[PDB]
Write a protein that binds this ligand. Structure first.
Ligand SMILES: [Zn+2]
Ligand SMILES: [Zn+2]
Lengths: 294, 292
């Protein structure tokens, strides 16, 4: 009868608890809401969209894995499709600060890896840090993305990132979440296809090093992550983190991993192999193999 | 002579005043206060205009091996010393191992014992990663950021509604004096690595680490771990040592021996990233010294 949501649920208004309870019954609730589910919660609570997003933040934060700090952070990315995607921060004991995932990166890559074409807004509890402001300026929403914070007026990303640097200053015209297909041939079994398709839609205009990770779980589920570079370089999200983000957001723990594949080019400018191996080993996963692109 | 090209870009008077200061092949990529004063006398520039004019020399120190876009920065210490920085990118590694020019210059001043910075001068607006990095320093949001053809501004101007160590109630900020007290012993390179760990900044994980590199001619360069309140802009200890190595006019083939000092059972572990990055740079003599 375990549930990562129970304690957080007690902190929610009674009407929202009742409304979302049928949606959270599945232990592997996908930590996203279809547009019709957003409408159902609005009807069952009377909240407008901004207030409902704020009210849901404790459930997103309850998905987080702050194994080092114990400080749960949540975020909700609102797609133009009308779907909303939860994110939570992730920290990895035995790895490094560079492997950590902020809640904003978690929610944004959640939307992107589920095929959302762009975001209209993001809702958080605390002002995104400079690393996240730089991450968001990679997106096709650019400086116009609406940032929603409790008890304050909504503002565009421009408000938080004066004199911004981003892909346009590098004359990049295909932005993160724009449609991309690098055309590597897809073949093999379900997990191999997934890893190659993840690499095919990755965002890497600075190093031209495509990469993707796919994980196959004990119950047969596959989650994949696509590499997402950033104009400022360091806020880049590696492909492993995207896959681990989805795995955790979907209610799994790292021992659920039964197979793991990294698809990349063995002689690309940048190589994800070593960090992928190291971070998986920190999580107790020793089973990782490479599918070679090109 | 990695400065020869950049030197041709300077005004004649500045060229003639500084070209002697760059005489030694391993010019330490910093200027003493008396050297800044000499350059000011020989050009009549105020310190802001001099720093702007010196940015091509700092940028000449950079190693943008991926992008080929050199970025320079000049960190003005409260001592009056100026410290050059340049960006570093590492082929065969990842985007996470990158060092921004601002991080380079601040790390330079810090590892040379500068107590705090009064300002930083750059040619391009610092990115959000660098704005967050700079909010770790004991100069806080008041640090002055100087950009060409722009009004100078506090870091507060570039990072509204900032998050930093002060929000986590950290009272020992980056560049404040720290000494974690681990016992120093062994050969010179081992002691350098332990000393590097003793002055590192790690209030979030309490995972101390330092790296020391021994070059073929016997020179040792070390780097201390520097965490960041936002976590990801953290500078690993290896990056600090490679920064110093390159800024002082060396290339990675000169590395003969490398040591990481850290706690075996620490919450965060630098060993695997350190080995993998050094291996991408052709160094395979890497040992680990364990802190109590
Ligand atoms: Zn952040
Ligand atoms: Zn930067």
């Amino acid at each position: 009868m375990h549930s990562r949501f129970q304690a957080a649920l007690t902190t929610l208004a009674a009407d929202l608890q009742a409304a979302i309870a049928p949606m959270l019954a599945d232990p592997h609730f996908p930590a996203l809401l279809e547009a019709d589910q957003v409408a159902t919660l609005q009807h069952a609570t009377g909240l407008d969209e901004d207030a409902l997003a704020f009210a849901l933040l404790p459930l997103a934060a309850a998905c987080a894995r702050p194994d080092l700090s114990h400080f749960n952070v949540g975020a909700i990315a609102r797609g133009v499709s009308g779907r909303w995607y939860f994110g939570g921060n992730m920290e990895f004991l035995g790895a490094t600060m560079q492997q950590t995932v902020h809640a904003e990166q978690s929610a944004i890559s959640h939307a992107w890896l589920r095929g959302e074409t762009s975001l209209r807004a993001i809702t958080v509890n605390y002002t995104p840090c400079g690393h996240c402001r730089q991450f968001m300026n990679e997106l096709n929403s650019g400086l116009a993305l609406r940032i929603h914070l409790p008890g304050r007026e909504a503002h565009a990303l421009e408000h938080y990132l004066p004199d911004a640097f981003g892909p346009k200053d590098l004359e990049i015209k295909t932005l993160l979440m724009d449609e991309q297909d690098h055309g590597f041939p897809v073949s093999g079994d379900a997990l191999t296809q997934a890893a190659i398709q993840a690499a095919n839609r990755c965002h890497a205009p600075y190093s031209h090093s495509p990469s993707g990770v796919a994980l196959e779980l004990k119950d047969g589920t596959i989650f994949s992550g696509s590499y997402a570079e950033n104009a400022a370089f360091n806020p880049t999200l590696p492909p492993l983190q995207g896959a681990l983000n989805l795995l955790s957001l979907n209610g799994y723990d790292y021992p659920a991993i039964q197979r793991a594949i990294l698809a990349e080019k063995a002689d690309a400018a940048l190589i994800q192999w070593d960090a992928t191996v190291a971070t998986l080993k920190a999580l107790g996963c020793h089973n990782i193999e490479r599918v070679l692109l090109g």
